[PDB]
Design a protein around this nucleic acid. Structure first.
Lengths: 520, 343, 343, 117, 108
DNA sequence: GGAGGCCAAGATCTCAATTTCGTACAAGAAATC
DNA sequence: CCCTTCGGGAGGTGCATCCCGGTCTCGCTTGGCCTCC
RNA sequence: UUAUCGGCGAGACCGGGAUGCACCUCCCGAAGGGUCU
């Protein structure tokens, strides 16, 4: 992904920084000072190399356009294949080959395409960074108006919070209000040419949002800068064009299947990327016939409701007590995967300090530190949505958790502005579907994202053919085997096809009264 | 003989409301819902269709002309035929099923009945429901409370003789005592309404009859109030309505619309624009709407429809674009062969 | 017999407020919201309608004239009919067939009732909501705190006898003790309701009757206080009102208005302009308005309205434009053939 | 029996301030804004009404006069009803029958309460 | 008081499965022409006084591979108020075949 | 004078009544246009 | 370089409507009669 | 899939009346000063 490798100048900064602390190994420093090699490979191979590998300073600065990004890119242009982060494939999207070059020569394997699309739904954004706009107009600056920009900059952080995109009603209201309160500033730029440039910029922003798609509030991934997000429909067609642009692209993932049938489980990605019948060359589901063992316990239709009043996100005390006792009833190392970090907070607090010491994913805490710490000392690991897939692998490649506990199905919150704004899209593009229809479509899309995420969660369970996982789904809404008409029946697709027999024969914690009804 | 699809939006100038017997219940007044309690309320196509049918009936009445005093040549039966499609005489020619070109003569000579139909005669005009655009856009309007005039301003009390002042005194004392008694009876009735939930069908029956006789007790208590039968001071229940400025997507169709029938429909829209009121609570000016429709015809067998023109109804006027709509209106206006009178 | 649309703006000379039961909640006085909770507030058309109806009632009372003592001929029932349209004698039937054609004569002889209908007679006048033009044009006003007179100013102590200063000392000590009691019980009630949040649905009712127990104990600690029922010192919760100078778009319709009915309406507008007070909070001078209306008419079948004139109500006077408005006012003033003592 | 509108201006000889409890964000003492954070602050009509009501109360007690020791004939409840508008002994009810048409005579006898209610 | 009738809500997404059995190009072309003419007045059911029945439907036209049990997607029939979007060259070929082959004798 | 079409007549009967509510989050990478 | 103040008191009541008015049909043959070929 | 095929449909304005208002002063206490052609 770049920005995480030798920066030349920061490696002459490293001369000074090490001599203060790493003086003993300054000789190895100069060995690094000369070989401008990607750090990532560097450490793992040279025996351990812990002396001078602290990442913070070895990396690019904010304005580190030192022309070395080309040099590694030119060096890596040759390859048998390119393991790398996604970035280039959408970073050279509209650079027009200024980064990667030849395209038809290259083939594309988008591994983990499920997360690719899921975060594409974020990348369908252009960050109207008021600090950048503040910084952009540093000569034609109506500084009196900066307060308005500053007040709005506060509001974005309040609504966006810790999210790069947030679908509360405030976000679109703040989007419209911010651009109206920026239109106020629009009549403050003194230079008329700059005023018209600013007016055209906001007008392009104004039409881009209202004409079609979704508006929102952003907090930039890096530097945590507030921003005003809105759809890039152009990018929405561009991604399809640019993946068809490759000679033959392959989207592959471990959870890119809502259902086990391709020809109905693949339409979420076909429609998301706008992909029509042209480029659907294969739709295949490949699963191992035997890979590890799965035992299933699912909370029956009587298990208390998770949210008593979900609007304020209050977890019903009956549910919290039942989940906590069930977790305490475990007898081995476990990976309790929650959906939110607040659920982690509540479970950790109510959990009465049971043995096999617990381990909690603090909001924002990088998972690497906690997972490595838990590897040495096993026990209950109460992770959250921050699990980001990966694996809680034991140090010598062995399963160090027997019990994957899904406290609740990670249901996505309602997006009452994504539905509204998408309805605006369909209305202005002429498509006639009522707002409730768009609400239903958004609900189904979110439920398919929940199915994919929970499939990822269950995939955390088994990684080696010898793995044995006791999956405990404590959500009451997970469909019972006997309830084939249950509302969230698609969630049954979370279990792999091969382990569906134990799904049918599964111990139910809190089942619902059956009988011997004579009219059988 | 074209199939005109009017696709458009009804922006709301004053709250749009309707009381439909099915939707409203004892919980309060609720707008007709798009299939469920937690559904988007929709303005019924029935109310829009009836308003447009009465507008077209008035158009036909004015076109046929008014006599010296102002009476139309149509009798009562003809007016009911034109406005509600009900034949009170029973002479209306029932079209026995299987009759080829059923009412083609009546359709030709009665454009209004051809548009809005009759019993056994299909109405070419289909007026669809007006669904809102965007979440919210409905709310509990009206509300408030009727207040004793003299207890709000004492200046209206200088206009009353002593006997009338004592009459007001008696009215207020009667209202207070009746309110106390009826409130006790209603508290007992509410205890029964809680007791419903143990609805053993026999106990459900007896409890319901008990609520019935408690209602009769309330009615008898209110019947023994000499001065005022009804409590003057009382909160007005709010009515659910679409907010002002609400955008309601609306679709109308005229199937197999002759130029005369479509001209009549456009003239009905023009006359409706004079008083563009839909629904009720018109005492609160509810129902005023500005609506813009795009008229698109679709020659069957063609992959795309062609937009004949646009009808925009606003408080500043009716703007009709497209020469086709003007030609249709002129064709309706210049045909003398409409025997709207019953056969 | 033409439709008159008063489309115009109300400028608020002083804050404009109203207290609708459904609109208000445990928070305090809040304007209706024009939709959901966060929707832009609107002034009820019901308050405007009631204010103008009582203005018209006073107009009719003055026009009929007052006897020497200053009393009006109208019966109390007639006053209620004219101003609030409630038949206290209960002789108003809703769908009595025989009044089907008596409606026209009743309207002709009672212009006010035709304008503002009654139960069974449709009101020709629809007074719409006033909706603000801009945003953030409302706010909380009236926030205050009743304070002991003799602690704000000490010169009022020299006017009280010894037994009355001792009375004030007993009152102050009862207020401080009551306060400590009601404050500790409400500081347990608020945390008990902050536990009702995470509540098992069944436990909702138990914590609810616990809340009602605490409320009964607050009301018995208040009924215990001898000196005072209510504590003199207290913060008055503010009410929500439209800001001063707020421009609210208003739309009023008189459907098929005869010259004399529209004249009565304009006379009602003038008499309301004498005291341009809307809503409530007569203390704090809330409700004062400066409203200007453009009266437009629309002959059915015409594609455009005709602006008859403008009705400007300002604190400096009532300006009437257009010969037609003057003609209607004069026609109402000169028509001596109105009877209001008989519905 | 006429409606008098005093329309006019207040010129501020010394700074004019008021601590409206709702208005004052604990951040700092802010004058009560005429809607939202950025509107024009106004002086509440409540404070002016209270000042004028206490002035009228003082006018009434001075016009009634005082005893040789300088004590107003009124009692504590009467003062509180006159100026604060609050009844000590609870003899104040709204929309109660029988006090109807006692408003005219009460207002005639008590011009202060008629004015300020 | 008019009794209510039970309908599907406006903007109800109803899953629809239609099939033609073994199909000469002419029969499939006639069916596609019937769909194209139904799109002129896309009305299903009665209560046409309230404009009931107006629908817009997207049909993915799949066929079976010769021999193999797998659906191949030949095109899409998107009937909307804005127009009929016949997609897929094969559907156009079927429509053209129906338009040609004028030897049909519908009489008897 | 035969062949179409419209309209009235013909035996009693078989059966059953819902009572609204979805879904409540995390972060992967970045020379961004 | 100082240093950001304590508190006080949060309502009392009213009144919650009356009434309409709930359809035709028709799933079959047959001849009698009334007009046309 | 014990055969082949059969749009259930046509018409209706639910509307008519009401001011929610009536009372409250949120005030009391203070020097920001000294320091350098």
């Amino acid at each position: 992904g770049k920005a995480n490798y030798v920066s030349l100048e920061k490696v002459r900064g490293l001369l000074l920084m090490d001599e203060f602390t790493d003086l003993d190994t300054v000789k190895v420093l100069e060995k690094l000072a000369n070989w401008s090699k990607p750090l990532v490979e560097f450490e793992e191979e040279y025996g351990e190399l812990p002396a001078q590998i602290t990442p913070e300073m070895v990396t690019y600065s904010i304005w580190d356009d030192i022309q070395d990004i080309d040099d590694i890119r030119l060096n890596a242009l040759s390859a048998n294949f390119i393991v790398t982060t996604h970035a280039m494939v959408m970073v050279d999207c509209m650079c027009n080959h200024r980064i990667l070059g030849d395209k038809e020569n290259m083939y594309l394997i988008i591994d983990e395409a499920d997360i690719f699309v899921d975060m594409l739904e974020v990348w369908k954004q252009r960050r109207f960074n008021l600090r950048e706009l503040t910084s952009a107009f540093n000569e034609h600056i109506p500084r009196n108006g900066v307060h308005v920009i500053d007040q709005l900059m506060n509001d974005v952080t309040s609504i966006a919070g810790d999210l790069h995109f947030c679908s509360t009603p405030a976000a679109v209201a703040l989007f419209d209000n911010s651009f109206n309160a920026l239109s106020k500033v629009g009549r403050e730029i003194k230079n008329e040419a700059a005023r018209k440039a600013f007016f055209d910029c906001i007008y392009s922003w104004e039409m881009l949002g209202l004409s079609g798609g979704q508006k929102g509030v952003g907090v930039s991934n890096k530097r945590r800068e507030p921003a005003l997000i809105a759809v890039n429909p152009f990018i929405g067609m561009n991604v399809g064009r640019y993946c068809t642009q490759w000679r033959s692209a392959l989207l592959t993932s471990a959870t890119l299947s809502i259902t086990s049938t391709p020809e109905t489980g693949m339409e979420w990605l076909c429609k998301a990327l706008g992909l029509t019948s042209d480029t659907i060359s294969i739709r295949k589901i490949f699963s191992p016939d035997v890979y590890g063992s799965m035992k299933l316990t699912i909370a029956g239709a009587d298990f208390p409701k998770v949210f008593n009043d979900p609007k304020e996100q209050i977890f019903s005390g009956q549910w919290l007590k039942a989940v906590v006792e069930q977790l305490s009833c475990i007898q081995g190392p476990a990976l309790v995967l929650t959906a939110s970090h607040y659920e982690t907070r509540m479970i950790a607090n109510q959990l009465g300090e049971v043995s096999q010491p617990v381990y909690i994913q603090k909001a924002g805490q990088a998972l690497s530190e906690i997972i490595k710490q838990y590897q040495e000392k096993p026990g209950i690991l109460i992770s959250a949505g921050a699990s980001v897939g990966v694996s809680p692998r034991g140090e010598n490649g062995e399963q160090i958790f027997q019990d994957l506990i899904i406290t609740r199905i990670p249901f996505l919150p309602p997006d009452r502005m994504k539905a509204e704004s998408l309805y605006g899209y369909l209305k202005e593009r002429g498509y006639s579907r009522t707002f409730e229809a768009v609400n239903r479509n958004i609900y189904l899309e979110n439920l398919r994202k929940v199915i994919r995420k929970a499939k990822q969660s269950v995939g955390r369970g088994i990684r080696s053919e010898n793995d044995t996982v006791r999956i405990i789904i404590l959500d009451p809404r997970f469909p019972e085997p006997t309830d084939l008409s249950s509302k969230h029946r698609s969630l049954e697709h979370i279990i792999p096809v091969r382990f569906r027999r134990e799904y049918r024969s599964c111990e139910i914690l809190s089942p619902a009264y059956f009988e011997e009804d004579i009219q059988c | 003989m074209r199939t005109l699809n009017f696709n458009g939006k009804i922006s709301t100038l004053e709250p749009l409301t309707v009381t439909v017997k099915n939707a409203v219940s004892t919980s309060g007044h609720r707008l007709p819902r798009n299939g469920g309690f937690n559904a988007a309320p929709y303005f019924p196509g029935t109310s829009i269709r009836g308003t447009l049918r009465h507008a077209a009936h008035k158009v036909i009445v004015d076109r046929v002309g008014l006599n010296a005093d102002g009476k139309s040549p149509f009798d009562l039966a003809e007016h009911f035929m034109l406005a509600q499609g009900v034949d009170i005489n029973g002479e209306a020619e029932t079209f026995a099923p299987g009759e080829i070109n059923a009412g083609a003569e009546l359709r030709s000579k009665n454009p209004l009945i051809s548009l809005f139909g009759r019993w056994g005669l299909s109405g070419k005009v289909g007026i669809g429901n007006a669904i809102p655009d965007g979440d919210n856009q409905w709310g509990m309007f009206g509300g408030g409370a009727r207040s004793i005039m003299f207890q709000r301003d004492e200046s209206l009390m200088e206009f009353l003789e002593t006997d009338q002042v004592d009459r007001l005194e008696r009215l207020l004392e009667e209202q207070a005592e009746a309110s106390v008694d009826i409130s006790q009876i209603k508290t007992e009735q509410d205890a029964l309404k809680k007791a419903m939930k143990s609805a053993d069908k026999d106990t459900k029956a007896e409890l319901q009859i008990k609520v019935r006789e408690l209602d009769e007790k309330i009615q008898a208590r209110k019947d023994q109030k000499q001065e005022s039968r009804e409590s003057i001071r009382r909160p007005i229940d709010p009515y659910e309505a679409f907010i002002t400025g609400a955008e309601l997507s609306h679709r109308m169709s005229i199937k197999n619309a002759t130029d005369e029938e479509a001209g009549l429909f456009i003239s009905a829209l023009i006359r409706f624009a004079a008083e563009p009121r839909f629904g009720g609570h018109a005492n609160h000016n509810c129902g005023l709407v500005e609506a813009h429709w795009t008229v698109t015809t679709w020659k069957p067998g063609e992959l795309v429809p062609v937009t004949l023109g646009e009808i925009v109804i606003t408080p500043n006027g009716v703007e009709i674009t497209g020469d086709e709509l003007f030609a249709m209106v002129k064709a309706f206006n210049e045909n003398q062969s409409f025997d709207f009178t019953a056969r």
